[PDB]
Design a protein around this ligand. Structure first.
Ligand SMILES: [Zn+2]
Ligand SMILES: [Zn+2]
Lengths: 200, 8, 197, 196, 199, 9, 8, 8
């Protein structure tokens, strides 16, 4: 990708936001990987929408790219697991533990075992490390604070966290110039389409 | 920091 | 002059497509509701991705907008239900039946009942109307062919099914022109602020 | 079997109760089919122990023996089903409906459908026939009274509902006499006793 | 219990068997705790009827009575658990692990953990200690052989495994004598057993 | 409807 | 087009 | 023998 193409994506991002196509903004952020939107990320984590959280992240890093992003996913999947326990859905909790958390066992055998054994507790708050764990809303928040730090420190995100500065509607402004350029080649004083060059 | 715990 | 903005959305759709941002293309189709992509739709229906199918459709029509769009959703939710039966997940089949299919009961009380009763069959193929129903892959295909016809006849899709014809990369070409207009005032670093020499 | 044998079963029933083998009493009631124990039946219906209820009944009648016994099983399995809906276990409710209630569909086609359709209601009390159905403890009791009447009218049970009255420990008393007979003219009950 | 009473129970057991009331026989075995029926026990183990197995055993011993009886229950509940995993029902496997197997954790913390960790395997046969477990049918059989030994060696069962030998229908024969004793007091030449016969 | 099947009675 | 169907 | 293993 040229820096021109990269820049064009940003213009498009601004346009999409101005027209309030909200979901399209974040799919473009994700698939281009040019801008990580914190505000959005926080919003989704607080809402506990974990499938979207992991999907949004997957546009910026894989699980094993580096230890920062590895702790990021670990935290996310851990909280997913605990919420499953807290609604007493042990079928879901085990599914998470095998599909999501197993990748971390290679690197930590002992923690995975300790994580597994929470399945047999009346309340995981019986474990002394998890004893101070509260309402779901509060746990998400605590973890979010940690995630923000992990993202800000992650070398893969470091140049992606701040939106560039632009006058409103830059794309519409550029489009305007192309219409000016086209007609300035015409032999007379109506723009019908953007689809084919204008003439008079 | 980096290392994985079972904390907050 | 709103055809400008609308046309600009199309340019952006083509750009996104060329850059192969596939999910962004289809969110834009959906949220703008300007272009319905059949090819994409079929692909999702074949894949049994039902939440996305309904989500994509929701940008174009609601269930009660008209009799076409009503049969469209009904067929989708019906197949969803049968698949649940066919994998023997009766808890999911009932959840579908209450949440997704119930809205149709008001105007067909009897059909809803006939559908509900399929829960008590060993195999819903014991019902003579479902008697020829085979493979999941095949059922989806049969139903898809009908959906296409229903969508093409739905007046809410009027002029949404055919992509406009444009030269490749028209957006990049226009952008190209704005850089031409900017420098012509000379004698490129950014697209963010006008260029000078 | 004989009426002696039949009578001996009753003695054994009394003995078992006095020695407080509670479960063994009722298995004997069931397998002999000689005495249907109402008190026990009520208790199990109230407890919602449906497999035990059907198992106990199975010693006295099959489902299609007569219209009385048919309605008895139908009522039980219906309540089983409703409880499943009421705890929102729709997976169990469908299982009950196919395995337990389907048999009634042949001669009750419409009713089976009407019962199936309760699956799609937020609350089956939306159905006007089931609208007055109160809390589970109460529904069981209501239904129990009807079961009791169906049983009392059932020709297969009507001659089984009354325990004979006996002095305490009649069995032990008869055993005692056999030892009297042997000595004329303790070691064991296993082989006849003898002297010198 | 008197030994008269205890013997009377055995007479009744023989009677119940001859009348082929099979379920009543085993409930009496269980509730009296006088006779443990191996043949019946085996049949239930092979059938995997675990609630009946534990119910039948509960009449003879509790889980913590002695090390033999403890290993017996442990083996039963372990196999219960493994079968649940083997049919891929992890919801049931976890329910078992908390309700049935947790009691054994006090006595071995580490083994409980190792067993719990089988939840995360594709196949518990990946564990080398379980690598040989090939069939639910075969596993049950293997385990049964061990249970038989544990029961035969359990000092709480040692006086309970062999039915006394009796002439057929001893109860009926005794009953007969009571009718003879009753009539020999009546002068002179029985309908009910409920009250003494006369003439 | 002594022995008639309905829901419930 | 597989059944059962509301028309169209 | 009276040991809790798995399984044998
Ligand atoms: Zn011109
Ligand atoms: Zn004597």
């Amino acid at each position: 990708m040229s820096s021109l193409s990269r820049e064009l994506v940003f213009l498009i991002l601004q346009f999409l936001d101005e027209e309030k196509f909200k979901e399209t903004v974040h799919k473009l952020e994700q698939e281009s990987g040019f801008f990580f939107n914190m505000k959005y990320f926080e919003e989704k984590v607080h809402a506990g929408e974990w499938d979207e959280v992991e999907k949004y992240l997957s546009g910026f890093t894989k699980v094993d790219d580096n230890r920062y992003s590895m702790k990021i996913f670990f935290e996310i999947r851990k909280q997913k697991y605990l919420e499953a326990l807290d609604r007493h859905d042990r079928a879901k909790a085990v599914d998470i533990l095998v599909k999501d958390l197993k990748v971390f066992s290679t690197f930590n055998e002992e923690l995975y075992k300790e994580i597994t054994q929470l399945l047999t507790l009346e309340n995981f708050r019986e474990n002394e490390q998890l004893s101070k764990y509260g309402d779901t809303k509060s746990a998400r928040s605590i973890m979010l604070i940690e995630l923000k730090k992990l993202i800000e420190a992650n070398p893969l995100f470091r140049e992606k966290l701040v939106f560039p500065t632009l006058k409103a509607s830059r794309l519409r402004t550029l489009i305007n110039q192309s219409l000016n350029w086209q007609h300035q080649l015409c032999k007379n004083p109506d723009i019908k389409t953007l689809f084919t060059d204008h003439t008079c | 920091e980096l290392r994985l715990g079972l904390p907050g």
